[PDB]
Amino acid sequence: SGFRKMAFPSGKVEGCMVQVTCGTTTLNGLWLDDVVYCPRHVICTSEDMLNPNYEDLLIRKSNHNFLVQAGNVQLRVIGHSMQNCVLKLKVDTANPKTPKYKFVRIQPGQTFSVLACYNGSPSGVYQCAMRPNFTIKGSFLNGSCGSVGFNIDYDCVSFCYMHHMELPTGVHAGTDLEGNFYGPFVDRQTAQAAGTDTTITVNVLAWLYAAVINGDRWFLNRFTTTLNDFNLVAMKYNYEPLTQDHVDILGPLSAQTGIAVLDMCASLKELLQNGMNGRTILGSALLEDEFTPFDVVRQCSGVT
Amino acid sequence: SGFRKMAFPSGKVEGCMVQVTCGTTTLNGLWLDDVVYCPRHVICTSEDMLNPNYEDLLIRKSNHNFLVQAGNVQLRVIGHSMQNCVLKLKVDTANPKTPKYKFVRIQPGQTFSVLACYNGSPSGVYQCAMRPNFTIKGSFLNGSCGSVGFNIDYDCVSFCYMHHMELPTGVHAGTDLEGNFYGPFVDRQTAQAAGTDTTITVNVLAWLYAAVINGDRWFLNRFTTTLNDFNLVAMKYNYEPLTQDHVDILGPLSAQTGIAVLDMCASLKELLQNGMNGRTILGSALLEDEFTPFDVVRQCSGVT
Numbered sequence: 001s002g003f004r005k006m007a008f009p010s011g012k013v014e015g016c017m018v019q020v021t022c023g024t025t026t027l028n029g030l031w032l033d034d035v036v037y038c039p040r041h042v043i044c045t046s047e048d049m050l051n052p053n054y055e056d057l058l059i060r061k062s063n064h065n066f067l068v069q070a071g072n073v074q075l076r077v078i079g080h081s082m083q084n085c086v087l088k089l090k091v092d093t094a095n096p097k098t099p100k101y102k103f104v105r106i107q108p109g110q111t112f113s114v115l116a117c118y119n120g121s122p123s124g125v126y127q128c129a130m131r132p133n134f135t136i137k138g139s140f141l142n143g144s145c146g147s148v149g150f151n152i153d154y155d156c157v158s159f160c161y162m163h164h165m166e167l168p169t170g171v172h173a174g175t176d177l178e179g180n181f182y183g184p185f186v187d188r189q190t191a192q193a194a195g196t197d198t199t200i201t202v203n204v205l206a207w208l209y210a211a212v213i214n215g216d217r218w219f220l221n222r223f224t225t226t227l228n229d230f231n232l233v234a235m236k237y238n239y240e241p242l243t244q245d246h247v248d249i250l251g252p253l254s255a256q257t258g259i260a261v262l263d264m265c266a267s268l269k270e271l272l273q274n275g276m277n278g279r280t281i282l283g284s285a286l287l288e289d290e291f292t293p294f295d296v297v298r299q300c301s302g303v304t
Numbered sequence: 305s306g307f308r309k310m311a312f313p314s315g316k317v318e319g320c321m322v323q324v325t326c327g328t329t330t331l332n333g334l335w336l337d338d339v340v341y342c343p344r345h346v347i348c349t350s351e352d353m354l355n356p357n358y359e360d361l362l363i364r365k366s367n368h369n370f371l372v373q374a375g376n377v378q379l380r381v382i383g384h385s386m387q388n389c390v391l392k393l394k395v396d397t398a399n400p401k402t403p404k405y406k407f408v409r410i411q412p413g414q415t416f417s418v419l420a421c422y423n424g425s426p427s428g429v430y431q432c433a434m435r436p437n438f439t440i441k442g443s444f445l446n447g448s449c450g451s452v453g454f455n456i457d458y459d460c461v462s463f464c465y466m467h468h469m470e471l472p473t474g475v476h477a478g479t480d481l482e483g484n485f486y487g488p489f490v491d492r493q494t495a496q497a498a499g500t501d502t503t504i505t506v507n508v509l510a511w512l513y514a515a516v517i518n519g520d521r522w523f524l525n526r527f528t529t530t531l532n533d534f535n536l537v538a539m540k541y542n543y544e545p546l547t548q549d550h551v552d553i554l555g556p557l558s559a560q561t562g563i564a565v566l567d568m569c570a571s572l573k574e575l576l577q578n579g580m581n582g583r584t585i586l587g588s589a590l591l592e593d594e595f596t597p598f599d600v601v602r603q604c605s606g607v608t
């Protein structure tokens with residue numbers, strides 16, 4: 001038993017991380033088959049970043065302006081292509097460590113593992129969520145860009161995130177592996193509004209089932225509610241509305257514990273109204289929303 | 305910027321994980337060179353676990369009663385030895401993925417990465433601390449035993465932990481890689497008292513520095529204090545006393561921020577006395593103690 005913020009094992013992704021250099025700019029790239037993927041802003045001089053014309057800037061680059069190091073081995077870049085906000089660098093070598101992989105675009109509320117890298121070297125692995133406003137609360141310093149987020153489905157790495165930017169508020173923004181930003185964000189150093197960040201209500205409920213499974217039950221009350229009563233209270237507290245799809249997703253946890261979703265909604269309504277009164281749930285003094293119902297089922301069934 | 309509970313990349317340790325089977329009992333093993341390391345309780349039937357005589361049970365086993373699977377490859381066991389609470393199985397094949405490695409015994413308050421495994425397969429990586437009472441707040445299910453904890457110093461993997469036990473209180477106990485238990489625990493299904501779990505004061509201070517670096521300053525107060533004033537208050541709140549070694553170790557963070565250790569001690573004293581009043585620090589509604597000063601330096605400098 002016990003419950004922790006758990007990342008997927010990072011090994012299959014470590015063997016894909018290379019260093020991409022263009023003039024001063026050194027950041028991380030993802031080496032799958034004979035293609036290296038990185039942020040297209042590797043081609044920007046800090047001055048460009050104000051208002052970059054990425055076509056005009058890329059046009060003035062040759063294959064040879066791009067330095068790719070895989071450990072100590074140099075990869076010959078034999079092609080440079082722009083797909084939305086990512087650079088695709090064709091290389092002379094297929095990566096022999098390439099795992100089975102897909103590119104996915106994840107939805108708000110979904111979690112992924114981030115392999116935080118600097119100079120194409122892995123430093124750290126942490127789990128986080130796509131926030132409803134399509135930001136992530138990550139840990140990223142200078143050189144971290146091109147760090148990827150991924151899920152693992154047995155043998156298949158599903159890449160969902162590539163890190164491009166921090167907003168002045170200290171939260172993070174990036175793209176799927178086809179170079180489309182999550183959220184209304186652009187790869188430009190100008191004022192960008194995130195949106196009001198709401199709580200992921202379905203995830204809070206899954207974490208409350210996590211809590212009951214680990215013997216933390218003090219917040220289980222007598223009452224019940226409706227999807228409509230609950231949502232009317234939830235919106236007051238900047239919580240995402242709960243839909244029937246959310247209730248059906250919470251089904252297995254409901255069945256395991258013998259607590260109906262709408263009884264757990266009734267308990268969460270209390271916690272929002274009356275507060276936690278200084279009691280912790282699974283060692284946290286606040287309601288946690290960065291665990292999906294799959295994340296909870298993984299870690300209370302032990303999927304490998 | 306940003307700040308997360310971050311595990312080391314798990315790749316080098318994934319390459320060492322094997323499944324060990326003895327009669328019914330299946331659990332995880334660590335394969336370094338031509339030796340497999342696992343919990344000695346692999347030889348116990350659930351009935352034995354009440355009061356096991358490990359000599360009498362081991363005596364009745366031969367090299368061929370031991371099935372080691374490394375993915376699909378069966379390893380031929382050519383020798384079996386007991387060192388404290390671990391089995392050493394001599395195998396015909398040195399592990400070609402053996403990294404540079406040490407066995408270290410960590411101190412209370414130090415952090416490590418856990419690679420949670422089932423049937424010799426990696427499922428997840430999370431960071432935690434050796435509690436002052438020599439327990440860990442982990443996530444382990446049935447089959448998790450032989451899962452290891454490690455630190456990584458560039459290319460060298462320092463193994464510090466092998467999981468053996470959950471206590472009835474839902475916290476965890478295990479050994480160093482020479483099979484010595486952390487704390488007063490034995491590998492038996494009998495009543496074992498953990499000890500009073502205190503807060504790791506040096507880690508709380510490092511985390512407060514982490515907070516100031518990330519723009520979270522609201523708790524920086526007017527006062528100062530002495531090592532003795534602070535410690536006198538710290539003991540009242542079940543915090544570990546702060547020593548000169550702790551002040552010296554907090555030096556880099558002190559220098560970075562221009563905030564002297566005893567000024568941060570003075571701030572922490574207030575938080576203990578007044579409580580947190582419902583505000584958060586780095587997204588937590590309580591004082592976090594599972595980040596060392598090295599962990600904070602790692603993540604506010606980006607060591608790779």
Ligand SMILES: *[C@@H](CC(=O)OCC)[C@H](C[C@@H]1CCNC1=O)NC(=O)[C@@H](CC(=O)[C@@H](NC(=O)c1cc(C)on1)C(C)C)Cc1ccc(F)cc1
Pocket residue numbers: 024025026027041044049140141142143144145146164165166167168172186187188189190191192305
């Ligand atoms: C990754 C790239 C890098 O380090 O370059 C190689 C040397 C890096 C990661 C972030 C910096 C520290 N924390 C991070 O997450 N990203 C950058 O270097 C970009 C930094 C930004 O994201 C800036 N964003 C803005 O300029 C901005 C300001 C406002 C109001 O809205 N957006 C913040 C640090 C402010 C640099 C960059 C790259 C590409 C761009 F199109 C713009 C900026």
Ligand SMILES: *[C@@H](CC(=O)OCC)[C@H](C[C@@H]1CCNC1=O)NC(=O)[C@@H](CC(=O)[C@@H](NC(=O)c1cc(C)on1)C(C)C)Cc1ccc(F)cc1
Pocket residue numbers: 001329330331332345353444445446447448449450468469470471472476490491492493494495496
């Ligand atoms: C790992 C062993 C494994 O993989 O089994 C091989 C098939 C596993 C870890 C725990 C299971 C649940 N979560 C865990 O972290 N260990 C066990 O299966 C042991 C179970 C325990 O540790 C029990 N502890 C006690 O028996 C106990 C009771 C008291 C007062 O103090 N300690 C808990 C389930 C309660 C089984 C085991 C192994 C070795 C032993 F010496 C005794 C018991």
